[PDB]
Amino acid sequence: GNFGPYGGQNVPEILMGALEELEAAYEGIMKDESFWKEYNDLLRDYAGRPTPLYFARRLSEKYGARVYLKREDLLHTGAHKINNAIGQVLLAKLMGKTRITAGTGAGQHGVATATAAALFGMECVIYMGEEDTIRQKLNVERMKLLGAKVVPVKSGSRTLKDAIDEALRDWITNLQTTYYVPGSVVGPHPYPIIVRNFQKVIGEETKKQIPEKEGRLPDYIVACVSGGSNAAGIFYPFIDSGVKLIGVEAGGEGLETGKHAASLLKGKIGYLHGSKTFVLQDDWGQVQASHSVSAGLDYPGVGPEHAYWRETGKVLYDAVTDEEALDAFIELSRLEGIIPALESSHALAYLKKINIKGKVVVVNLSGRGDKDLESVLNHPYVR
Amino acid sequence: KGNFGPYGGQNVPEILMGALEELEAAYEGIMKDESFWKEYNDLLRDYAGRPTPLYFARRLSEKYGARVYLKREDLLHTGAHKINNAIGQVLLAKLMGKTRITAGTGAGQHGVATATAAALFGMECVIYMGEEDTIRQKLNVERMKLLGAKVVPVKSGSRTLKDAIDEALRDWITNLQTTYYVPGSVVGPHPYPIIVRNFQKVIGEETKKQIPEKEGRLPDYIVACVSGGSNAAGIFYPFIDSGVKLIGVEAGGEGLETGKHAASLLKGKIGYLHGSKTFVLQDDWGQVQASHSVSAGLDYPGVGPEHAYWRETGKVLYDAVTDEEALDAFIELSRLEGIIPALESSHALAYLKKINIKGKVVVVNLSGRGDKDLESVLNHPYVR
Ligand SMILES: C=C(/N=C/c1c(COP(=O)(O)O)cnc(C)c1O)C(=O)O
Ligand SMILES: C=C(/N=C/c1c(COP(=O)(O)O)cnc(C)c1O)C(=O)O
Ligand SMILES: Oc1ccnc2ccccc12
Ligand SMILES: Oc1ccnc2ccccc12
Ligand SMILES: [K+]
Ligand SMILES: [K+]
């Protein structure tokens, strides 16, 4: 589970037995026709796959380009997270586990996990930073109705990083019964591989859909990147194809302000939540608090596969600010009638940063922005 | 003809007759135009997300000893079947040269769907909403603002859907040259009930193609909630006279014998409402009465004339469930399947407990998702 020098299994020793068990089970289902039948049936009828690739005519006219939106916002629960949550909770049920735990920032992973746990009849305990239980309270309501226990985390920054800390402590305390579901491609092997392999359906669909619209591969594919699961899913089938793959990190108040979540652009090599990867840290190796207007991107690390792609030049990375993402959120609502997630709005904001006159561009619309409605309107820049 | 047996017609002030004949003429022109349906079908597929899946609800099927399938209209863009009609009508408005859209809304799903379509086509949009539904469906009020629409709250009358539609029709009458009125249901003067039903019948045409690949035959039952009746008409129409038992479920409110409900077909009388001769909740003196329902989307005192005709000729069966039965089905689908249904659709799901379906194949129209209803459902005394 190494992507060049990145990745690995950097965990307390007690977890190695659990990770070896998970790796053996996963390798078992990768050749199991019955797993992929039930999983693909649920993706189609329960989640709503395949998602359409939508020609955004008014957006295209504004930029003089051909802009297509991969509509992951149309999935059940409203975000790409459901592709991963269904697959992993199914794997957990097949392994004999009876309990699910996870951390969540925007609440989209928590809702998707609680949804899969209700579908498969499993106990579910979701950890979420206290600050995020307010900015994304609508998702807290959904989780409780779906039968999950929501535990607010008041430690540290009280956001995603600290929720994951608590979920990992829960997992270690409950290894007998509990399967830990990471929401992104960050974690000890085999988790980054498992999550990416559940999300690459996005890129595989996109790869079959775009020739039907333009007769060729796109010029650009743009996706937002915090941990990196939605971007890994759409990028993976296109690696080394010649398409320009652009991952967009959260620039927060600005890359020079110290208030951002741009791990690849501003972090250093380090260890976080099981992975050797790029992490925002001070000069003494202490992990720093991240910041973003988007709770989903508010995380100080990045997936090890993206650190490897950045190093080898297979994917290009940049960042946009809070204000640029807010402008793109408003722009898509007005021009196309689609309210995007504030996470995905970072990708849409990057349309202003590339020379795309006459170019074919696919933007990964990773989720819908109903959860962000209150925080956008109350933001001082929008007011 | 615009008449479903004795129901329907164009019972409107004279000032609207000209606009309705122009609308009927324009609609007949596009009914044979392949350039219209190519653009409309492409938008349904890539923008709204059609076709929607037919989902086998395994845990729900186990509870009732049946084979229960959900038609997942909740997975459409904006989260409800209303988008099918709103896209088609705003497209018609574009081809007619209109520049402004107006409508009324109850649950906010039609207001959001209409504002969404107006944004897509770059049109001015003005939505009217009852003041009560402004506070009970506040999530949809915010969506409409960011989509670029103006939302006018209505404090008149019962401050719900009926009064909002009144104001929207008043808006249309005073803006007849630039404004296209988008009804949210199969209620209104001809040709609107036909137009709305012909946009919604894609639900049933898809269902008719999907159910044989799951069961090799037609279902025993198809169940859908009914207020105005557009989602039920959409799924029922391709199945009329097919031998399938078609069941429309009206809002029973606090009980059919309490006077606090919205069951127009079961407890209304023949009357005129918003252009249609149909069944309307009224007193013995012919005065329309206020409806009531825990669901804002079903809180309407009339019903579409095609459903009045279907009930009279026996082609569809109609019944009701109470507010409490709807809330139970809302919680049940959330816990058992991980699907949070609209409170409107929950009336159809609650009816699974009211018929003998042991060993039967049942399709339920899941007309929307219920994220808009979470605050209302939790704070309800029966749930608390
Ligand atoms: C942190 C969360 N959200 C992640 C997220 C992200 C960022 O996660 P990835 O970088 O793993 O795609 C992007 N888009 C949407 C709609 C998201 O919900 C969470 O839901 O817990
Ligand atoms: C009254 C509205 N909609 C009602 C509605 C209904 C009732 O409308 P029809 O009887 O026309 O299907 C059913 N299902 C959902 C999800 C709904 O939102 C409105 O949004 O204004
Ligand atoms: O484990 C996780 C759950 C939700 N979101 C996450 C984002 C980045 C890294 C890990 C995550
Ligand atoms: O005209 C309408 C707009 C929205 N909803 C409606 C529900 C029932 C009957 C008419 C309606
Ligand atoms: K990050
Ligand atoms: K009614």
Tokens coding B83: 């988008």
Q: Is the CB of A364 under 6 A from ligand 1?
A: no
Spatial contact of B60 and B341, defined as CB atoms under 8 Å apart: no
- Tell me the fold of A2-43+81-195: Rossmann fold (3.40.50)
Closest-CA residue to A343 (of A104, A114, A178, A125)? A104
Second-level CATH architecture of A48-78+200-377: 3-Layer(aba) Sandwich (3.40)
**Which residue type does A376 have?**
V
Q: To which H or E segment does residue B363 belong?
A: strand B361-366
Spatial contact of A146 and B335, defined as CB atoms under 8 Å apart: yes
DSSP assigned state of A354: S
- Tell me the fold of B49-79+201-378: Rossmann fold (3.40.50)
For chain A, the helix, strand and coil percentages under 3-state DSSP, each to the nearest 5: 45, 20, 35
Q: What is the DSSP code string of A151-192? A: EEE-STT-SHHHHHHHHHHHHHHTTTTEEE--SSS-SSTTHH
CA distance B252 to B294: 10
Instruction: Pick B3-43+82-196's CATH classification: 3.10.310.10, 3.30.930.10, 3.40.50.1100, 3.50.50.60.
Output: 3.40.50.1100
Counting beta carbons within 10 angstroms of the beta carbon of residue B359, is it exposed (0 to 12), middle (13 to 18) or buried (19 or more)? exposed
CA distance A224 to B78: 23
Tokens coding A223: 């996706």
Give Cα separations from B51 to A68, A268, B71, B75, B194 (angstroms): 19, 46, 10, 10, 22
Domain ranges in chain B? Answer: 3-43+82-196, 49-79+201-378
> CB within 8 A of B34, min separation 6: which ones?
none
**DSSP 3-state of B305:** helix
Closest-CA residue to B53 (of A47, A83, A204)? A47
Name the residue at shortest CA distance from atom 4 of ligand 3: A183
Name the residue at shortest CA distance from atom 3 of ligand 3: A183
Q: What is the DSSP code string of B144-155? A: HHHTT-EEEEE-
- The ligand whose atoms approach the alpha carbon of A341 most closely is 1
Strand partners, B104: B128
For chain B, state the CA radius of gyration: 19
CA distance B331 to B376: 13
The beta strands (E) that lie in A194-347 are given as: 220-224, 244-250, 268-272, 275-279, 316-320
Residues with CB under 6 A from ligand 4: B 103-106, 110, 161, 165, 183-185, 187, 227-228, 300
**DSSP 3-state of B54:** strand
Chain B closest-CA separation from residue A90 CA (Å): 14
Which residues have beta carbons under 5 A from ligand 5 (an ion)? A 226, 261, 263, 299, 302
CA distance B200 to B210: 16
Closest-CA residue to A112 (of A131, A147, A85, A89)? A85
**DSSP 3-state of A249:** strand
> CB within 8 A of A194, min separation 6: which ones?
A22, A26, A87, A88, A91
Chain B closest-CA separation from residue A340 CA (Å): 11
- The ligand whose atoms approach the alpha carbon of B168 most closely is 4
Resolution (A): 2.0
- Best residue in B70, B124, B146 for a mutation probing chain A (most A CBs within 10 Å): B146
CA distance B225 to B330: 13
Q: How far is the CA of A185 from the centre of ligand 1 (A)?
A: 10
How many residues appear in chain B?
384
User: Backbone phi, then psi, for B325, in 5-degree steps?
Assistant: -65, -35
Long-range contact pairs involving B120-125 (C-beta distance under 8 Å, separation at least 24): B120/A58, B120/A336, B120/A337, B120/B43, B120/B47, B120/B87, B120/B90, B121/B90, B121/B91, B121/B93, B121/B94, B122/A58, B123/B90, B123/B93, B123/B94, B123/B98, B123/B99, B124/B99, B124/B100, B125/B100, B125/B101, B125/B149, B125/B150
**Experimentally determined by:** X-ray
For chain A, state the CA radius of gyration: 19
CA distance B291 to B44: 33
Counting beta carbons within 10 angstroms of the beta carbon of residue B272, is it exposed (0 to 12), middle (13 to 18) or buried (19 or more)? middle
**Which residue type does B206 have?**
E
C-beta atoms of B378 and A74 within 8 A: no
Domains A2-43+81-195 and A48-78+200-377 share a fold: yes
Chain A closest-CA separation from residue B33 CA (Å): 22
Pocket test for ligand 3, best of A128, A226, A290 (most atoms within 8 A of CB): A226
Residue B51: is the preceding peptide bond cis (ω within 30°)? yes
